[PDB]
Amino acid sequence: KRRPQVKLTAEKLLSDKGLPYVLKNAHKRIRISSKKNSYDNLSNIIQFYQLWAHELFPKAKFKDFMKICQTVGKTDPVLREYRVSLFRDEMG
């Protein structure tokens, strides 16, 4: 056989390398200021997510990363279990 293809998958997201890093650091990473423009602060939010997206899965363009994440986010039940777990933690 030819070599099988490599893909983004929910296992990567649920790994310690994956989504928990964002929730462990996002409160410290991003910082808005009224003292800078709407364009300035809007440009600031996407830095951390772009670098994180590259570190997670360097395959594809950034838009493709988001639009790929949409499918597995809607479909996979284990990922949805993790997400309801997050919002239950806030309900706690």
Binding site: Q5, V6, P58, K59
Partner: protein
Amino acid sequence: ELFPPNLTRRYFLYFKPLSQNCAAISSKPLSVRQIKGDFLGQLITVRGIITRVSDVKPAVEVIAYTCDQCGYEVFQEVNSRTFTPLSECTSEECSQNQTKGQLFMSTRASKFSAFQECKIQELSQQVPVGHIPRSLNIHVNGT
């Protein structure tokens, strides 16, 4: 090995032949006619007059590249008079991420060595009657 050991050798090395007064063929000078095909590979001594000298230019020994997408560097060693540069990042980590990145050459981390070429020719008073003088090509590297 991570990189070829030639990339970090900061020195040159040469042999000096035996003193004839202690003496072996390397101590006994040969004219340019006496250098037969038997001597290929050996260390010898030659006596004659130099005819022309070239000016110095660099020659590559180890070439360095950079991969754009995965941010990784690879090396290539050159021995022959010509070579083909690399054009694909065959690194295993880069491959397993399916990251078909592009390689670019860099001078700032390559290794060069000085080169010069000359030619030597037999003394006119040793030429046998009716013949035309012969000559040899000399290469010089390093200090």
